[PDB]
């Protein structure tokens, strides 16, 4: 069911544009070439516990 099915395989935000899954990300993350994964840009991306 697109986004209704396991968040449409998106790491973060999942939308439906023209009846198809569209993944997006929060600030500080870039959408990966696969258009599904979110790649953090810095050492302290939002929403991640600091476990160093």
């Amino acid at each position: 069911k697109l986004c209704s099915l396991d968040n449409g395989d998106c790491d973060q935000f999942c939308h439906e544009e023209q009846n198809s899954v569209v993944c997006s990300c929060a600030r500080g993350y870039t959408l990966a070439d696969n258009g599904k994964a979110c790649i953090p840009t810095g050492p302290y991306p939002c929403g991640k516990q600091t476990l160093e």
Partner: protein
Amino acid sequence: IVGGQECKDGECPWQALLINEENEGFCGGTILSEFYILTAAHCLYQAKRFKVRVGDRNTEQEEGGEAVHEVEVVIKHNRFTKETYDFDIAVLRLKTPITFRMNVAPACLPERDWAESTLMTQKTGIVSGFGRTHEKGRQSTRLKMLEVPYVDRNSCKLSSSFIITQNMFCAGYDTKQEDACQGDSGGPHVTRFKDTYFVTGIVSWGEGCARKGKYGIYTKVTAFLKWIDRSMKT
């Protein structure tokens, strides 16, 4: 926080603490970015002049990784009133930017629709703070976190002695002795999704703490995302 567990190293990096002139925490906050803190509007009444401390886990001794920040601008939601406690939300613009490190990191802001469809429909969320660990007691010196179940909308309105507006939501336990408590207000309510935590609520209020038949009342962040966006730009 009554019950729950103390936040181990780096587990709750987005927690913020509002400290008055006497360096004591009276409310919590959520780090949104290097310049902004999210909190409850009702907290702005609890003090005359306050600062924001980040990266602390033990109030007693100065650990070494904490930092105090002065507030440059206080953005209080104009529709708030102690009469209803509706619109219990405020944004703080800090004078100097927060430097991220261990125990100091922002929580992600979700997009309205997705958040409602994917985060709010989750079984649980996490609340944290330095509030009382018992209904009758002092403010905890250790930062604690607690997993609280999302509570049925209809079910919670029945349990409340006050009108639950659409800008509010319930989380917690009907009987089980685990709940937020006094002092945890303004603090973070975050929902985990694939090892990433999004801010979903703000500790607003509760009829006591952990009482049977009662729940914790949080401000629904999805209802103010736009307001939050405008507040972070102005």
